[PDB]
């Protein structure tokens, strides 16, 4: 019943029932690249360009559940696993892809 | 006549009157269903009798409570007290003593404060 | 007597605040219409 859209300093959650924005994350200091929902939904990751990822649980823009600082280059791709639910994959312009365990 | 039994509950300075009648099977803390006693961190501290004894024992009867005095935490403790005591009193007046005694045993297994509020007297030295 | 014989042969005001009749304002058509 939901889907997420990335943009310039705006992550917007839309509801599959009324096609209007239902939630907004905007604590982003620079261009947030990508958003990924956990294979069980409670948690999304969002890779920004400053060089970090914000990982925090859906529907709660008030909680920055965790901020992980990988290599300083911007991170274009972030995703959750699909067979494990505590393994989250990211990569950054450093051309090295890093698997973190949350 | 309507089978009818009343009990009481007292935390710090909070009164809780509880009528218990044989009827349609509901539970009302002062004109609004027990699912909406407001604290919301304690609503289960209110339910505790309901759950701990299982429902049908309540499906048979109607419980009305009204509460006053004290504040939030005291009123929640007072309601749980009055509900539990009222349940055991009704089941020892109009229903069987085996239910009485085993209910009392279940409660005193869990936590006796559902039955005898402590009048927590001051102390010398 | 015409009205009375026919019958025989057949603004704003609140009830609870009299103070309203003085209190009200003069609705004015131009005063709604204009977007000043």
């Amino acid at each position: 019943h939901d889907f997420a859209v990335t943009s310039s300093t705006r992550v917007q959650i839309f509801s599959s029932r009324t096609r209007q924005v239902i939630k907004t994350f905007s604590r982003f200091k620079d261009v947030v690249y990508s958003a990924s929902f956990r294979s069980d939904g409670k948690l999304l990751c969002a890779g920004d360009a400053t060089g970090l990822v914000s990982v925090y649980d859906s529907y709660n823009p008030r909680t920055i559940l965790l901020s992980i600082n990988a290599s300083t280059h911007p991170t274009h791709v972030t995703k959750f696993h699909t067979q494990d639910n505590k393994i989250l994959a990211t990569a950054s312009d450093d051309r090295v892809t890093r698997l973190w365990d949350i | 006549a309507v089978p009818s039994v009343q009990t009481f509950g007292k935390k710090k300075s909070a009164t809780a009157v509880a009528h218990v009648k044989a009827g349609k099977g509901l539970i009302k803390v002062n004109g609004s269903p027990i699912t909406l006693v407001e604290p919301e961190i304690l609503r289960f501290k209110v339910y505790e009798p309901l759950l701990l004894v299982g429902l049908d024992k309540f499906s048979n009867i109607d419980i009305r409570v009204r509460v006053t005095g004290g504040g939030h935490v005291s009123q929640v403790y007072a309601i749980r007290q009055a509900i539990a005591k009222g349940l055991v009193a009704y089941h020892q007046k109009y229903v069987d003593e085996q239910s009485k005694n085993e209910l009392k045993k279940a409660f005193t297994s869990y936590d006796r404060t559902l039955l005898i509020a402590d009048s927590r007297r001051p102390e010398p030295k | 007597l015409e009205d009375i014989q026919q019958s025989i042969l057949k603004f704003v005001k609140d009830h609870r605040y009299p103070g309203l009749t003085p209190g009200l304002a003069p609705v004015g058509l131009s005063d709604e219409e204009d977007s000043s």
Binding site: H1, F3, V5, F14, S16, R17, R19 | - | -
Partner: protein, 85 residues
Amino acid sequence: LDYVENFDSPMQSALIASSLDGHVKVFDPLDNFQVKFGWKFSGPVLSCAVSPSTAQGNRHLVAGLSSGLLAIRTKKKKSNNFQRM
């Protein structure tokens, strides 16, 4: 590019792709990936995604246009005596 499957469709599995020209296409992985359908939006469409397979609700198709446009195309989905009488 995104792949969906095992959802209510005469096509068993579907693959949708976005090709910078308004053109988003639907292929299937059973006919050796042949073109099956397509749309065209104006700008270069950079992202595309479909509602997943257990939507059980009004299904949606989200396209993101580098022209700064989000676009979505969707498919929608007496008296008791008398009765005892």
